[PDB]
Structure formats: structure tokens, C-alpha cells
Design a binder for this molecule. Structure first.
Ligand code: FES
Ligand SMILES: [Mg+2]
Ligand SMILES: [Mg+2]
Ligand SMILES: [Mg+2]
Lengths: 168, 108, 21, 110, 215, 71, 51
RNA sequence: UUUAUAUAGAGGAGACAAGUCGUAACAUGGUAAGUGUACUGGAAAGUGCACUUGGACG
RNA sequence: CCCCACUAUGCUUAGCCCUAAACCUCAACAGUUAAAUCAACAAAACUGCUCGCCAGAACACUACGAGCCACAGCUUAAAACUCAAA
RNA sequence: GAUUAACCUUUAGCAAUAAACGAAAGUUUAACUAAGCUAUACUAACCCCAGGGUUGGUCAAUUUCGUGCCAGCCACCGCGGUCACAC
RNA sequence: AAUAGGUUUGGUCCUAGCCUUUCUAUUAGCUCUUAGUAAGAUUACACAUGCAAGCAUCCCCGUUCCAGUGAGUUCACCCUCUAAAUC
């Protein structure tokens, strides 16, 4: 089987489930937490579960952990403007922490939908090109148009080999 | 191996595939320096027709001549291909019958 | 001496007969 | 605000103070292993300008990208010492702390 | 008359006896099944192949398992078991998927009456170990009714072809629990690397999903 | 268990010791030549270092020691 | 607005932490009273034995 | 000027007619076997010291 | 092989060499005895975590390179030819 | 030409598109277009017009002779010393 | 790497390699009817010959493009800044 406790954490299907996508302001997130303590348990599980997903959804945000540096776990986001956002996470479960950070710094679903629409706007359906970029490679695919000569040979009149004969 | 060890060593590396007697080529032009016979390793008993030839790469190697009967002599141009002769140790080349000076197997 | 075929390599035609009829 | 340096803000660990007015900081970023899909720390060395020489080897600092590289490798300035080594001030409560225990209790000042 | 017999392997075991030295004998593994969930297997040793066949099938007909089948065409849940040195990973599959399994597993499943299933065999491919491990895994599987009775909850089936309609396949015969089952955000299960790689698409294989004859 | 692998290792070691005994003088001469080449190459590397550095000669008071000699 | 809300949440959590710390400090005062009650007798017995 | 740098005496590995020679190993394998190391011997090996049971036993 | 005599050596001092069937042939730490106890044998079966190591046999406790007070040495350690096994 | 196991014609036209130039009609282009050669591949057809490999097992499929550990065969296991489903 | 298969032994179990079966490409043998399309020196080795860049009232502009090759090789991507170029 897959090595490690909770191997589901190491699947793209799980890493892509992070609902938290930070605004462009966030640059650094420091996770201070304690390896032992009943109050910090949720924070610990947060570091066990949500730090991957978040880091997957925000590849350009530097996430740095710190074990047993302060008596209470907390997050400290750094924004581009220089603001520092301190989020106490003691007594909060990992799901509550994710909800809180999504509320205060994550993009709203409307912004994500707008960005997805912007991305989909690039691939115009009417374009023709390789399957990597366009839905169709040639107009011959569209029915009604003259088909590709590799499949249906063209009439002798439409082929230059005999247009040249007509020229003669 | 632990996950950290796997990450450190990285994905396993495919060993460099060894080039055969033909040096990774389907065929090689050769010049027959001499011809002789080789005794196959036991328990097979025979007199296998073979010929030392100088390949186009400059290397000289022993090649097996299949079929019955041959006009191959010295200085005759042949084309050799891969495929070891099972009962002959060290013979890893076979002469392509019907190519260059190697005439087809004289029937009967 | 002479060749002695391996006991495990000896052919069996019972299956051929069964499939034949 | 505009700067040619890529990493605008980085939180790192000072691992050197030998250079004059320049702290050598180590910044670790999580990187996804494409084969294991596990996140591993990848560490990069940065040089931060420290005018006051207040960096101690081992403290956690915040580095802000300079508008231009003042030297060949010095591209960042020490914005703030997030955690002084052995002198951590608990941001949640403001009281000093030594590891996971309070040197001064939050109840002390009431 | 309802039962069909199929040979899984025939082996010429040679035994060294004091007087005769090497003596030939036939060991035959057969499986018998009626196609309606009742099947078994047996070994037969003899001097003649036909005697081995007769012994093996007449003994297998006395050792019948009963393999519970979901909708009479597939297994109830995904199974992964190791018998000795043979790993069998069977996957429940929808109707029309056919039998994509080791040929011995295909034969045994036809005898049982399973039409749709996937199965990968790893480790030693010892035919007897594979066969009896397969029978063990199929016999030990838990039906939806058994699951509902155990946990006292409705077993609700969600089908993509049927949209969001909840289909109840099994309801507990006793009292129904009022407290919802705890919904852990991260389940604690042991996944298979092969399954994960296949799902992610990184499982490049020039031998997987090859077009094959109807099963 | 049997000791076939151990026996093969023992035979290999016996053959190797026999070969060393047979040709120990030639091996000693070859090793001495190899040590000479080693020292020469080391000195050439140091010379290359200070030549690329721009110094016309070795630094004052520097002599490359014979680090590859028993004496 | 989100920053102000986060600061308000931090203040609320700080008040809860202060209450919890007060309760824990009272409990630790009781525990220290018990420990000193044991330790005074232990040290007195040890000193008397040594004397 | 030695080394680098382009072939060529000589060694080593495998195979070949293969058996000859010794009978070391496998049985308490004919003197239990083996690891390390040392000396002797052209070699087959022999012995010293410690260790192992992957030997046996009143 | 046995007997006798005798030396290096076993001993002390000070250095060196750094090997073993250095083997409980069982890595360290933590946990479990419930499932399926389990290829076999050895020594009941496993789980979590970490480090080290292995990827057919032989070539090879080898060659070369490097390091070492080691100079018939030790550590690290290949490849070519060959086999369909080991 | 040489070399390698590796082997396209010493064609045509600027009519299309593209480029250069010009205010422009236009001009030029071995880019390109339209042809030539080649079972390298794909598609389509055959009405007369099919060959290549294999047939011991893996692995679909051998009758009769000849040969006699020879001649020969095999991808792996292997076959052949007289009656070879393996030449 | 599979739905796997053959192969170690007197035999079984396990470990393990090798090979088979699938799909492409090049070359070779033998064979080959037509039509349409696509693709097409082994070689950064040497080249006979012909052509491949002109335009245009002179100046200018263009011949720095297109085409070709894969010898060399982390100059290709993102950001900052900012030339040339076009409007
Ligand atoms: S690909 Fe569209 S006409 Fe051929
Ligand atoms: Mg040897
Ligand atoms: Mg010991
Ligand atoms: Mg350890």
C-alpha cells in the first residue's frame, strides 16, 4: 500500500480540494504550533492536513512552520503591503481554521468563477489548430465542407493535376 | 525505503542499456576475412559454419552463416545482423542470406 | 555416452487426443 | 514598491552574521515532489542588508526585497526580526515566552 | 446437472519411491460452480488423469462455497487480500464492464456467476494459492444488508447515471440509528499506489486497457 | 545451510593471495610508480592554481611536501 | 473590514484564554498547596532523621 | 625534462579437447566445518590464537 | 597427524594496525495481541516512525580512483566478455 | 562524390497564400503552390490479378519421405545418433 | 510496467533474472495492382552545374526575412526596467 499514515494526503484528488485560495496580497504564511497540547490539537491536525492543500492552491506563497516556539499556536500571514495578519488558532479545529483563513484572506467564489471564465475565454471554439489548443484541426472536419483529401479524394476537376491539363 | 529516503534518492534511474555486437544498428556491412567451423557447446554436437568478418566499424567479429551450403570466401562482402547463435558461445552475429556477395541458400 | 531427455520435458499427447475427440 | 527582485517578502532563518552589515539567511519553501506528492522543504540562501547588526545566528527574520540589488548577492533588507533567538515575545499575548511556557504570565498584568 | 466443472491446472508430480524410483502421478485442480453463486474447488491426485478429474470434481462438489453477488452480477465491495504470497485486488464494476481478471479468476467467476469485475494478481501466481485466496476473499465479503444490520443505518447508493437520486439498497432490520455517522473530512484507509497512479493518469502502461476478446 | 557461497569466497581469496605472493615485487614497483605519478600530478595541480592566480612563481617560503611517500 | 473582524476575534479568543488561564492558575495553586503540604513533612522528617 | 599522450611484451577473467592429478567440501565426507590473521610450502595445503554452530555427544 | 627441544607470539610499558561466523546471522524508538496467526524454516504475528542498505548469477572481500602510521594491507568499489539460470 | 544497414527530380508556375519593393497598375521569389520519385504510413477498390511467415510447448496451425548428434533449427525451454508432429 | 505466459528442481514452495504475447519506427530478405493523402540523405563529410533578391523616375528600402541543419547547448519561461520596430 501507499506508505505513511493517511496516504490520501498524497493524492492530487486530495490536494485539489483546498477551498482556500489566497488573494494576491498574501506572500508569506508562518504557522507557529506546538507538537503537544490539547488546545493546539486542531492546529496540529491543520498542519497535518491543510498545509499541503493550501500550498497546492497557492504555489507562490511561502509557507514556513515553527514547532514549539510559543505557548500558543497561531498563524501570521504577511501581505505585500507590509501588513501582518495574526490569527490565533488555539482551541480551533482545523476545519474552523481553514474557514477563518478563507473568510479573511481567501478569494471569494465569485472571483474564482470570474478567473475561470477569463481562462476559458482564451480557447475560442471557432479557432482551428492542434488539439492541444483548438477543438478542431481543419475546416474539413466540419460537415458540409469539402472533406480532407486523405479520406475522400477530390473530384478530378478540383485537383490541380488536371487543372494544369485544362491549362494546356 | 521511507518517503524521505525515496525523495533523497529520487526516482530510480534506468540503467544505460547495453549496446549489442551491432552497436545498436539493425545491420552491418562486413568483409569476410576467413571462414571455418565451430563446435557447439555440449550437449549439441555439430560443425557450425562461421566466418570472421571485419565490420564497417573496424571491429572484427565471428558471424554465423545459416542455411546449407555457401559460396562465401575471403574478401566477399556480406551483411551481418544481430541474433545470437544459441549453441555457439560468443557468436552474436548472423549473416543475412541473399544480400551482397552472399548468394541465396543453394537449394539442393 | 548418449543424450538422456529430461523427465519433465517429455511430451504428452493425451490432451491432443481429448481435443481431437 | 516596484522592484527587480523576484521574492518581495521572505521569512527566513539567519544562519550567518560573519559578513559586515549583511546577514546570511536561509529561507525554506515547501516544494511538491512530483512522484510522491509530498511537500518537502527546499532551502535557499539569501543575503539581507542589516545596518544595525541586530541579527543573531539562529533568529527568524523577515526580509523585504530591495528596489535594486545593492551588491552581487545582497538583494533584500532585514524588514523585521520576527523571533529573536531565545527571546521570543508571544504575539498572541505579548508576553515573553521560553519555548512552550510563559516567562511572564498573561494574567500577571491582568 | 446444474453444475459445470473446469480445470485450473494439471501437473505431473514425480515422486521418488524406494523400489520404482521416479513414479509419475497427476495432480489436478478443478473448480465446480452452478453459475448461481455456489462454487467450490478441489485437488485430485491419481495415477491416471481421468481418475484425477473424477476425484477432484466429485470432491469439489462437496466443498461448495456460496459467493454473495451484488445484483447477481458482481461483488459487493472492493476486495484486497494476500493469501500466502499472492495478492488479489478485486474491484466491483458496473454492468457491462465484463471480466478483466486473470484467466483462472475469469473461469472461477464464470462458475460462480460474476459477470463484471476487475482483478489484479501480484506476487506469486501459484494457481492453488490464487484460487483458494480468491475463494476466501469472495466468501468473506460483506453484503449491503449485513452492513446495514451491523451499523444500523440505511445503505444509500449514488449512481452517476441516475443523477442525485438516492437509491436505498439495504435498510437495517432492527432499530435505525438516530445519530449520524461521524463524517471525518479525511478517511483513514490504506490506498493502493497502483489505483492512485491510474486515477491520476500517471499509470502509463502499454499493456493496460488492451482490447481483448469478450469475457 | 550450505556454505557454497562462503567456499567460493574462500577460494577467491586464496587465489588472490597466491597471485599477490607470486607477483608482489612487480606490484610494489607499480605502486611506487603510481605514487610518483600521484605526487607529480598533485604538484602540477598546485602549480596550475598559482599560475591561474597570476603569481609568476610559488608563494615565498612555500615548498610542496611529499605527501605520498612513506618517509 | 476583514482585518477588523479578525482583530475582534483575536480579542475574544484572548478573553477566553485569560479565563482559562485564571482557572488553571487556581488549580495549580491548589496543586502547589498539596505539593508543599507533602514536601514540608518530607523535609522535616529527613532533617529530623539527619539530626 | 619527466609525465601526459596516440599501439604493444606480459598478467587476469571466461570458454574450449577435456579429461588427467589431489580427494579438500557434501555422511561425524573418512582428521567436524567455517570466519579473521600469521608463519611455513613451488603448489595440493599444514599449523598457531581467538571466535561461530551454519556439527555431534555420557 | 604423534614425541621432544626451542623462537616469533600470548604478558607489561608506549605507539600502530582497524579485521571476524565482530552472530541474538533479529537496525533504533514507540505501540498492539485484535484480525488473516502465518510461503517454508529459524525466533509468535504485526503496526507507526526514522536512518542505513539491496535490485539476476558470476567476474568481485577484484581492477582502477581516493583515503589511511597501513607498503604481500584495510575502507569505499566497478566494467567488459560469459550464463539462463544463481 | 565519398560514407552508412539507411539512397526523391539536375519538374513547372508565380495562378493562390506569404515576403520584399512601389502611390499604383504591378514586379521578383527553388518561400510556397501544383506536379515527379519511394509500400514509410493512412484512406479507398479489386472483376480476372497473393504473397510472406509459421505449424514441439509458451502460441493459432503437418501428411509422406529423406537425413542420422551428421546436415541443420530455435525468441526462451530445446530438437536431431534410424520410426524427427521441432532438420 | 499487464488479466498475464514460458523458464531453475527428482519434486514443492519462495525469491529472481531472462524471454514470450501488444504497439510504433528504421533497415534487410522475399513479394507487390490501382487511386487519394501524409512523410522522406546515414553523415555539422567534400561539392561539378543551374537557379534560389530584388523593387523602383535615380534617393531610399530589401537582400538581417523566408528556407536549412541539430554541431554546440540549462540565452527558450515569469517578473522588473527599457531600446529598436508598428500605429
Ligand atoms: S486536415 Fe483538413 S483538409 Fe486535410
Ligand atoms: Mg573464483
Ligand atoms: Mg562475539
Ligand atoms: Mg541505527
Amino acid at each position: 500500500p501507499m506508505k505513511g499514515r493517511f496516504p490520501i494526503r498524497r493524492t492530487l484528488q486530495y490536494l485539489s480540494q483546498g477551498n482556500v485560495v489566497f488573494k494576491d496580497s498574501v506572500k508569506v504564511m508562518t504557522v507557529n504550533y506546538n507538537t503537544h497540547g490539547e488546545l493546539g490539537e486542531g492546529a496540529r491536525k491543520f498542519v497535518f492536513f491543510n498545509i499541503p492543500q493550501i500550498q497546492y492552491k497557492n504555489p507562490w506563497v511561502q509557507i514556513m512552520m515553527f514547532k514549539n516556539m510559543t505557548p500558543s499556536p497561531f498563524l501570521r500571514f504577511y501581505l505585500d503591503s507590509g501588513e501582518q495578519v495574526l490569527v490565533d488558532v488555539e482551541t480551533k479545529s482545523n476545519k474552523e481554521i481553514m474557514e477563518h483563513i478563507r473568510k479573511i484572506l481567501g478569494k471569494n467564489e465569485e472571483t474564482l468563477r470570474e478567473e475561470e471564465e477569463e481562462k476559458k475565454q482564451l480557447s475560442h471554439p471557432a479557432n482551428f489548430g492542434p488539439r492541444k489548443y483548438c477543438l478542431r484541426e481543419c475546416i474539413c472536419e466540419v460537415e458540409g465542407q469539402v472533406p480532407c483529401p486523405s479520406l475522400v479524394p477530390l473530384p478530378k476537376e478540383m485537383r490541380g493535376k488536371y487543372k494544369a491539363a485544362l491549362k494546356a | 525505503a521511507t518517503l524521505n529516503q525515496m525523495h533523497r534518492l529520487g526516482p530510480p534511474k534506468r540503467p544505460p542499456r547495453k549496446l549489442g555486437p551491432t552497436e545498436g544498428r539493425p545491420q552491418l556491412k562486413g568483409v569476410v576475412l576467413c571462414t571455418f567451423t565451430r563446435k557447439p557447446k555440449k550437449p549439441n554436437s555439430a560443425n557450425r559454419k562461421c566466418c570472421r568478418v571485419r565490420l564497417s566499424t573496424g571491429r572484427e567479429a565471428v558471424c554465423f552463416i545459416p542455411g546449407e551450403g555457401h559460396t562465401l570466401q575471403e574478401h566477399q562482402i556480406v551483411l551481418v545482423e544481430g541474433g545470437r547463435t544459441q549453441d555457439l558461445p560468443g557468436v552474436k552475429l548472423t549473416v543475412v542470406r541473399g544480400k551482397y556477395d552472399c548468394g541465396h541458400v543453394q537449394k539442393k | 555416452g548418449r543424450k538422456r531427455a529430461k523427465p519433465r520435458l517429455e511430451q504428452d499427447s493425451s490432451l491432443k487426443s481429448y481435443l481431437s475427440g | 514598491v516596484r522592484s527587480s527582485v523576484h521574492a518581495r517578502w521572505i521569512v527566513g532563518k539567519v544562519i550567518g552574521t560573519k559578513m559586515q552589515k549583511t546577514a546570511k539567511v536561509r529561507v525554506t519553501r515547501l516544494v511538491l515532489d512530483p512522484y510522491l506528492l509530498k511537500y518537502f522543504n527546499k532551502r535557499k540562501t539569501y543575503f539581507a542588508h542589516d545596518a544595525l547588526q541586530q541579527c543573531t545566528v539562529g533568529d527568524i527574520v523577515l526580509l523585504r526585497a530591495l528596489p535594486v540589488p545593492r551588491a552581487k548577492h545582497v538583494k533584500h533588507e532585514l524588514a523585521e526580526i520576527v523571533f529573536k533567538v531565545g527571546k521570543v515575545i508571544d504575539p498572541v499575548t505579548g508576553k515573553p515566552c521560553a519555548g512552550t511556557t510563559y516567562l511572564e504570565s498573561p494574567l500577571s498584568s491582568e | 446437472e446444474d453444475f459445470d466443472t473446469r480445470i485450473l491446472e494439471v501437473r505431473n508430480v514425480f515422486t521418488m519411491t524406494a523400489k520404482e524410483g521416479r513414479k509419475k502421478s497427476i495432480r489436478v485442480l478443478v473448480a465446480v460452480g452452478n453459475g448461481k453463486g455456489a462454487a467450490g474447488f478441489s485437488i485430485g491426485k491419481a495415477t491416471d488423469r481421468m481418475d484425477a478429474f473424477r476425484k477432484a470434481k466429485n470432491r469439489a462438489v462437496h466443498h461448495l462455497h456460496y459467493i454473495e453477488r451484488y445484483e447477481d452480477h458482481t461483488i459487493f465491495h472492493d476486495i484486497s487480500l494476500r493469501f500466502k504470497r499472492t495478492h488479489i485486488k478485486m474491484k466491483k464494476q458496473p454492468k457491462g464492464y465484463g471480466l478483466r481478471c486473470h484467466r483462472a479468476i475469469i473461469t472461477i467467476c464464470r462458475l460462480i456467476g460474476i459477470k463484471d469485475m476487475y482483478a489484479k494478481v501480484s506476487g506469486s501466481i501459484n494457481m492453488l494459492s490464487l484460487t483458494q485466496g480468491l475463494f476466501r476473499g469472495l466468501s468473506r465479503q460483506e453484503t449491503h444488508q449485513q452492513l446495514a444490520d451491523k451499523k444500523g443505518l440505511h445503505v444509500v447508493e449514488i449512481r452517476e447515471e441516475c443523477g442525485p437520486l438516492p437509491i436505498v439498497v439495504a435498510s437495517p432490520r432492527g432499530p435505525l440509528r438516530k445519530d449520524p455517522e461521524p463524517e471525518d473530512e479525511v478517511p483513514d484507509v490504506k490506498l493502493d499506489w497502483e489505483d492512485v497512479k491510474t486515477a491520476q493518469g500517471m499509470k502509463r502502461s502499454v499493456w493496460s486497457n488492451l482490447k481483448r476478446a469478450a469475457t | 545451510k550450505n556454505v557454497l557461497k562462503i567456499r567460493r569466497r574462500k577460494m577467491n581469496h586464496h587465489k588472490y593471495r597466491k597471485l599477490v605472493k607470486k607477483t608482489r615485487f612487480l606490484r610494489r614497483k607499480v605502486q611506487e610508480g603510481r605514487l610518483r605519478r600521484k605526487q607529480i600530478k598533485f604538484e602540477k595541480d598546485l602549480r596550475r592554481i598559482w599560475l591561474k592566480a597570476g603569481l609568476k612563481e610559488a608563494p615565498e617560503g612555500w615548498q610542496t611536501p611529499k605527501i605520498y611517500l612513506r618517509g | 473590514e476583514l482585518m477588523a473582524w479578525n482583530q475582534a476575534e483575536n480579542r475574544r479568543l484572548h478573553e477566553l484564554r485569560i479565563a482559562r488561564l485564571r482557572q488553571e492558575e487556581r488549580e495549580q495553586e491548589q496543586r502547589q498547596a498539596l505539593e508543599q503540604a507533602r514536601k514540608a513533612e518530607e523535609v522535616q522528617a529527613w532533617a529530623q532523621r539527619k539530626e
